[PDB]
């Protein structure tokens, strides 16, 4: 379970605290939080604080629980009593709780890990100083490689990160210094050759330097935007930046200056092809570049909205605004209406064009205000929440579905944890003595055997002689032919729809507003089913006697009673009530 801007634990404190290892001072706690193994997770002060408080609270908790159980050698809900230990019900209950809580723990940590490699702000920097080829290659193949559709973009990503690191070098914090070792250590293929197939060209690198200098790229984020837009035919337009881009004279001059200044130590076209991807990960020669790449992804990611800096690229990277327009309406409506209908009378044509204009105006008017109001409404669980709605753009943002799977697993675990309450704890004896005074009676005091349940309705609408006939016999066989499987799928699907409709009507039957609407869903569904049945039936009879064959059997069934004109109430059975009454109950909304 997670919502936007929530903290999740990536640490397992529980294991050590069950062994009895506890921390007192803050120094001890910092010592508890630091991975020996290669990776280094930095933290914001805030997250670190939160985590600390949680740690202390868990100390107090395990402490008081243990002390309670040493005194008795949990604490019940208000009106309840503890069943004895070594009672089946209590053993089962406690078991249930153990399992549920392990699940919830794992889920918490898994969502924490998603946060960690999604680069959520409270995990500001992942440091790789201690890794060896194994760790680096693996990190690469799990994080960078697998995700990417395009191979060639990975190289670009690498060089551009190298350029950003090399150009922004002063402003980086001290903990970053190690990575620059890898930057000066990068190996390039000689200018036009054993490394030509292994490593990229220097020319390329200077193209990307040109890009960092011309568009002022400070981030992996703007990096992302630039790298997606730069090879496209509209490039100048997409990447046109709010502080306007520097003029290529100065830039190419500064690139000449860097190129030359770096020679004495030992409009540029978009670069060519690069060596096949595998080289990067499997040649020792590229190992420093690889390193940069990882460092580029796990750090170098900052909150900022790239679409303040590149306001024209917002439409391309993520979807455009619907309130933003990149014939007359009447002519469109004419095209849909076909040639078989009269053309719109030219009154209505003119009138509709008028609306089309007024709507254009409404769009233009509300475009800004809707955006503003929307973000302000998000900043204020609450109606507005999500896994990710953040104001800022995150190119590594996790897929909604990975998070939702976890959440669902955690909610199962919660319901499981809640079950066990009635196993471990019990009501007062004489309360159940009292309770057994009013017996359960079949007729009145027991819920009726027909409740709303989807198979109850599916059964009811499959119990009709015509539809039972259509399913089994009537349609050409589902396995034998293609028409068979097609017709079968559609008949089944339509039954299913009408069933869902009746079901949702039955559940909400008591409240009028919802019932009239759900009722309209029943009408639409039933109409669909009726047209299918009617058609297929006619087909059966027309299609081209012998005793007891298909057609005779069909004509014996009689007239097909339409599911539309059926009057079924809440229990899925025809009503007791007078037709005038039933009709009024189910009438459309206004």
């Amino acid at each position: 379970i997670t919502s936007r801007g929530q903290f999740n634990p990536i640490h397992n404190f529980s294991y050590a605290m069950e062994r009895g290892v506890r921390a007192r001072d803050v120094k001890a706690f910092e010592k508890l939080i630091t991975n020996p193994g290669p990776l280094r997770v930095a933290y914001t002060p805030d997250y670190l604080d939160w985590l600390h408080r949680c740690y202390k609270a868990k100390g107090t908790y395990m402490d008081a629980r243990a002390v309670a159980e040493k005194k008795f050698n949990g604490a019940p809900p208000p009106g309840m009593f503890l069943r004895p230990a070594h009672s089946f019900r209590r053993l089962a209950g406690e078991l249930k709780r153990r399992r549920a809580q392990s699940i919830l723990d794992e889920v918490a940590r898994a969502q924490g890990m998603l946060d960690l490699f999604e680069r959520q702000p409270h995990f500001p920097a992942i440091h790789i100083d201690r890794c060896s080829r194994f760790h680096l290659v693996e990190l690469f193949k799990e994080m960078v490689l697998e995700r990417s559709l395009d191979s060639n973009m990975i190289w670009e990503k690498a060089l551009l990160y190298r350029a950003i690191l090399s150009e922004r070098k002063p402003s980086y914090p001290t903990s970053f210094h190690y990575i620059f070792t890898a930057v000066e250590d990068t190996v390039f293929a000689p200018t036009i050759h054993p490394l030509a197939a292994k490593c990229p060209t220097l020319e390329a690198y200077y193209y990307y330097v040109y890009l960092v200098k011309k568009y002022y790229i400070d981030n992996a984020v703007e990096a992302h935007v630039v790298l997606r837009c730069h090879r496209e035919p509209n490039a100048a337009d997409l990447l046109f930046s709010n502080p306007p881009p520097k003029d290529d004279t100065e830039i190419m001059k500064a690139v000449e200056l860097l190129r030359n200044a770096d020679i004495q130590r030992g409009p540029p076209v978009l670069p060519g092809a690069y060596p096949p991807i595998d080289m990067l990960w499997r040649c020792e020669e590229n190992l420093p570049l690889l390193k940069v790449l990882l460092f580029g992804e796990f750090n170098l990611i900052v909150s900022e909205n790239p679409f303040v800096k590149f306001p024209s690229a917002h439409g391309f990277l993520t979807r455009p605004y619907s309130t933003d327009s990149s014939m007359s309406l009447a002519n469109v409506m004419a095209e849909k209406r076909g040639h078989l209908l009269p053309s719109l009378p030219r009154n209505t044509a003119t009138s509709i064009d008028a609306r089309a204009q007024d709507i254009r105006r409404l769009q233009q008017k509300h475009h800004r205000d809707d955006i503003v109001s929307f973000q302000k409404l998000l900043r204020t669980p609450s109606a507005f929440s999500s896994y990710s709605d953040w104001s800022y753009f995150n190119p590594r943002a996790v897929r909604a579905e990975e998070r939702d799977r976890l959440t669902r697993k955690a909610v199962e675990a919660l319901k499981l944890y809640d079950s066990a309450t009635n196993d471990i704890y019990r009501h007062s004896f004489e309360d159940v003595q009292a309770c057994h005074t009013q017996r359960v009676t079949e007729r009145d005091r027991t819920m009726p055997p027909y409740l709303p349940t989807l198979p109850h309705f599916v059964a009811i609408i499959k119990k009709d002689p015509h539809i039972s006939f259509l399913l089994h016999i009537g349609l050409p066989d589902r396995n034998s032919s293609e028409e068979g499987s097609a017709k079968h799928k559609e008949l089944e699907k339509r039954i299913y729809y009408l069933a869902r409709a009746l079901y949702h009507t039955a559940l909400e039957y008591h409240n009028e507003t919802v019932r009239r609407v759900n009722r309209q869903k029943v009408n639409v569904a039933a109409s669909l089913l009726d047209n299918f049945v009617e058609q297929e039936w006619t087909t059966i009879l027309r299609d081209k006697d012998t005793q007891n064959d298909k057609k005779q059997l069909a004509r014996r069934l009689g007239r097909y009673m339409l599911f539309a004109n059926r009057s079924l109430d809440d229990t899925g059975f025809p009503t007791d009530a007078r037709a005038d009454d039933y009709t009024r109950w189910m009438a459309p909304p206004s």
Binding site: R426, H427, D431, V432, Q433, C435, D444, R445
Partner: protein
């Protein structure tokens, strides 16, 4: 012995309505036509006339039970 603790469902649904009028709804009363009395004549020992409104009288009642009384345009 007791194996269980449960919550007592009941179906209280009134769905039918039978209301039967009590007898006294149909009992008789005495109802009367009512017009504005324009005049009255009483006679038992001595005759007495009261005239409320003088108009041509379109209707006249005579009633003999204790005293002779004549209700004019009654």
């Amino acid at each position: 012995m007791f194996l269980i603790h449960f919550v007592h469902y009941k179906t209280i649904l009134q769905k039918y309505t039978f209301k039967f009028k009590h007898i006294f709804l149909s009992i008789d009363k005495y109802n009367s036509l009512f017009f504005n009395i324009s005049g009255i004549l009483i006679w038992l020992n001595i005759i007495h006339i009261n005239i409320i409104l003088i108009k041509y009288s379109f209707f006249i009642l005579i009633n003999n039970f204790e005293y002779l009384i004549i209700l004019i345009s009654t």
